[PDB]
Structure 1
Amino acid sequence: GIFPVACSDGYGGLVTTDPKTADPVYGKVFNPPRNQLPGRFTNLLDVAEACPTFLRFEGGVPYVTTKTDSDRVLAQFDMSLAAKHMSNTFLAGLAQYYTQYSGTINLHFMFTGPTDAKARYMVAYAPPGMEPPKTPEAAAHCIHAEWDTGLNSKFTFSIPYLSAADYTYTASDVAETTNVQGWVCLFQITHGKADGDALVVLASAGKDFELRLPVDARAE
């Protein structure tokens, strides 16, 4: 006799993501050598950490210019990977193919004014549950950093992952718990002759930034 087998219902159809491999039909092929080719990446978050890309401010520019009036808000946007400010970053371009993230997102600020142009800035993370601060003074009570210009043109700041749940969504729907994470607030404290000078800002993934659950959702 021969081995009896139950061919089971519910199993066997093609699944577009399944853990199995096709049957081979054309053997023995040997490839050209490609060992030590320059520029290999393994993990998309390696390049999301090592290469910051530019944010987008009103007008379709990667910078904010120092204003000279009584309004000290240079920028304010939603801590969302779906923000308009983030929409040209490599980070937002990756995040759209995943439904959840966790961890640190880093902002980089570069002063671009002449040597006789001086300024002092503040970045604050405003968590959800009340309205984002409109003044450096109200913002002082948030997790914040302040710095000024000098030899070193760049300052980098980690936006912290603070939420009730352990993961939050990359997509947004309508303002909820799982999809808005508050605001980031960029203020100018003062300046000395920096009128018109640009501060350009970039974002990169922090050391514990994590994207999980692949999704394809039309989009680019």
Structure 2
Amino acid sequence: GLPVMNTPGSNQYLTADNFQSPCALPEFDVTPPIDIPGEVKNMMELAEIDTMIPFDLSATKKNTMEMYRVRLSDKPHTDDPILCLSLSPASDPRLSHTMLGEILNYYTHWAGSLKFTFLFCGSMMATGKLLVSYAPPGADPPKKRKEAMLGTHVIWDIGLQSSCTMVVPWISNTTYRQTIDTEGGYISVFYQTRIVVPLSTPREMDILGFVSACNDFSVRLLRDTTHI
């Protein structure tokens, strides 16, 4: 017959191998598929979905409905931020649990832009200004409203538009970051003006926060760390 020469790698089973294989049911007429709504062709389609950030992971707030709400109140006008969110989507406990983070935990490398979307859930009457800042990687996060204003920022008007979609850029020395450890930036929200309200309307509102990958986002080198 055809003289062959069995090479190294013969009779080994590599779990990453991709060969043909004999069908155990070769005469069996498979149930044909139907057009179900919602076919996912890629996992990033699930990371491109605005999911809600848990900001308060304290002992009480966590694992409830309150861990997501950031409460704006009326107290002494301290320059410190309402929230400061580090942009370690995998190595930040807050973004780690989002859908994005759940998909990033399955991978080693990632690259792309994130879009954060804060959402005022207060009154139609209430008015005011927040300042949504973005410190780039390497920078030590802004501690006062002035430091934040001078850098990149968006003066969000609570009175006019009820959301604010700031998009982070892709800044990294490598073509890809890691999902574990080291910076990546900081979103941070300050009061520009203490929130005004009309009559006996409550002076304690809430802002929600969403995150999602952008169309430029990509991951690689699958790494499942799931076990018991």
How many residues are matched? 212
| CA RMSD after TM alignment | 2.1
Amino acid at match of 1:69: P
Relative to the length of structure 2, the TM-score reads 0.84
What residue in structure 1 maps to residue 196 of structure 2?
Answer: 192
What corresponds to 1:84 in structure 2? 93
Matches within 5 A, 1:44-123: 44-49=43-48, 51-58=49-56, 59-60=61-62, 61-67=67-73, 68-71=75-78, 72-82=80-90, 83-123=92-132
Distance 2:164 2:98 in 1: 18
Secondary structure, in 3 states, of the residue corresponding to 1:4? strand
CA distance in 1, matches of 2:52, 2:227: 20
Q: Percent identity between the aligned chains?
A: 27
| CA distances 1:24-53 after superposition (whole Å, capped 9, x unpaired) | 22213223343221221111222322x311
Matched, 1:24 2:23: yes
Q: Does structure 2 conserve the Cα–Cα contact (< 8 Å) formed by 1:81 and 1:171? A: no
Q: Which secondary structure state, in structure 2, belongs to the residue aligned with residue 119 of structure 1?
A: strand
1-structure distance, mates of 2:112, 2:120: 27
Q: 1:111·1:154 contact (CA, 8 Å) conserved in 2?
A: yes
Gaps of 5+ in 1: none
SS in structure 2 at match of 1:140: helix
In the alignment, which residue of structure 2 is the partner of 1:7?
6
Pair 1:13–1:122, CA change in 2 (3 A): farther
Match of 2:225 in 1: 217
Range moving further from structure 2, 148-157 or 53-62: 148-157
The residue that corresponds to 1:128 in the other structure is 137
Instruction: Quote the Cα distance in structure 2 between the aligned partners of 1:142 and 1:29.
Output: 65
Pairwise CA distance, 1:151: 5.4
What is the CA-CA distance between 1:11 and the residue it aligns to? 4.5
After TM superposition, give the deviation of residue 80 of structure 1 in Å: 0.6
Does the 8 Å CA contact 1:126/1:183 hold for their aligned counterparts? yes
Structure 2 unaligned runs (5+)?
none
**Which of 197, 210, 225 matches 1:202?**
210
- TM-score scaled by length of structure 1: 0.86
* Residue 155 (structure 1) aligns with: 164
